[PDB]
């Protein structure tokens, strides 16, 4: 008969050993640019809302002071 030992048609195809750890492109300083940007949004909006809340504050004190007598 023939022999049943293993090796097949040669090569088993290619195999990739070498190291790969790629792909993060979002990082220049521009990460700072987007974060600091987010701050620049927060202070804008929050500024507005605190102004509004002061307006309400004066209005409430007006309620009280009109009550006082």
């Amino acid at each position: 008969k023939v022999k049943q030992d293993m090796p097949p048609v040669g090569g088993y195809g290619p195999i990739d050993y070498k190291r790969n750890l790629p792909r993060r492109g979002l990082s220049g300083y521009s990460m700072f640019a987007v974060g600091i940007g987010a701050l620049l949004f927060g202070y804008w909006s929050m500024m507005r809302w605190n102004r509004e809340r002061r307006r309400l504050q004066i209005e409430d004190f007006e309620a009280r002071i009109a009550l006082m007598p």
Partner: protein, 318 residues
């Protein structure tokens, strides 16, 4: 009626601790690419009751304490603090509405370390002493920093009420006006609990939790309790402080839902961080805090003392 309120507050935080430990074991399980407990009950919902009544029933086990006072003091203190911390947390409504508030939580959180001094003190084992002193050191050093953060991020509220916080959050989450200080305060919340990276450990190490986690059996189910419950807290107090939902009155359970979801997810992130990273060595930790956090906190703070007066929006104390 009022004791009904108390019970409805404190019983569900205990059940929350048990089923929390469940979710911990599972999330770490799959995060580790392996199923968590399935074989206690269906899907793992009977696992806490196992841990509970067993871990209660294993016998007291050692040693002569040398102080009968402290040994039965420290657990009572650790719990009592961990339970009363939950009082002011806003919810739709606080269950005690305090004018000061958040600095009351800060204060009791500062008291929480006597359980470590005394707990580690009554061991009579001179090694567990040293370990305890050190854990007190790191907890205390991060009681420095955190306080300054609250004293900053609050300065956009204008008052301590802890209710008006939900009023500031209406337009924009407080994470946007300061993200970085919120980042530092998240890691600060990792500090006291000593979740990884900040945990101490078994094998070879200072082994503070060696005798601390070993000793006192059932009362270790207590220190266990106050530690996890305290975790759920700091997650919730994060969810309230640095973000939040819109409160629609006439239907508070809406805000309660959204609040709950974000808080739970946050705690999930604790348990999976603990999975994720190694531990710092001790000194590199302590003077990692002293090196970098505290200076930048000072900078951001003074920048939040000077900022609101710049833009002319300074918050409306009621």
């Amino acid at each position: 009626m009022f004791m009904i309120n108390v019970l409805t507050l404190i019983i569900p935080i205990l059940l929350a601790v048990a089923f929390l430990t469940l979710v911990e074991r599972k999330v770490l399980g799959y995060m580790q690419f392996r199923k968590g407990p399935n074989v206690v009950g269906p899907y793992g919902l009977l696992q806490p009751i196992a841990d509970a009544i067993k871990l209660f029933i294993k016998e007291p086990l050692r040693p002569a304490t040398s102080s009968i006072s402290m040994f039965i003091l420290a657990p009572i203190l650790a719990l009592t603090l961990a339970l009363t911390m939950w009082i002011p947390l806003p919810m739709p409504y606080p269950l005690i509405n305090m004018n000061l508030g958040v600095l009351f939580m800060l204060a009791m959180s500062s008291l929480a370390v006597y359980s470590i001094l005394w707990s580690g003190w009554a061991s009579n084992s001179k090694y567990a002493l040293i370990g305890a002193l050190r854990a007190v050191a790191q907890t205390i050093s991060y009681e420095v920093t955190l306080a300054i953060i609250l004293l900053s991020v609050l300065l956009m509220n204008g008052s301590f009420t802890l209710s008006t916080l939900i009023i500031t959050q209406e337009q924009v989450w407080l994470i946007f006006p300061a993200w970085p200080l919120a980042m530092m305060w998240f890691i600060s919340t990792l500090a006291e609990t000593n979740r990884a990276p900040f945990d101490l450990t078994e094998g070879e190490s200072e082994l503070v939790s060696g005798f601390n986690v070993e000793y006192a059996a059932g009362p270790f189910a207590l220190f266990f309790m106050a530690e996890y419950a305290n975790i759920i807290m700091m997650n919730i107090f994060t969810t309230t402080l640095f973000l939040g939902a819109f409160h629609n009155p006439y239907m508070p359970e809406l805000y309660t839902i959204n609040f709950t979801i974000k808080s739970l997810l946050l705690s999930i992130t604790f348990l999976w961080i603990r999975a994720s990273y190694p531990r710092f060595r001790y000194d590199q930790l302590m003077h990692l805090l002293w090196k970098n956090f505290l200076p930048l906190t000072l900078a951001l703070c003074m920048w939040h003392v000077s900022l609101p007066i710049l833009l002319s929006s300074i918050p409306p104390q009621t």
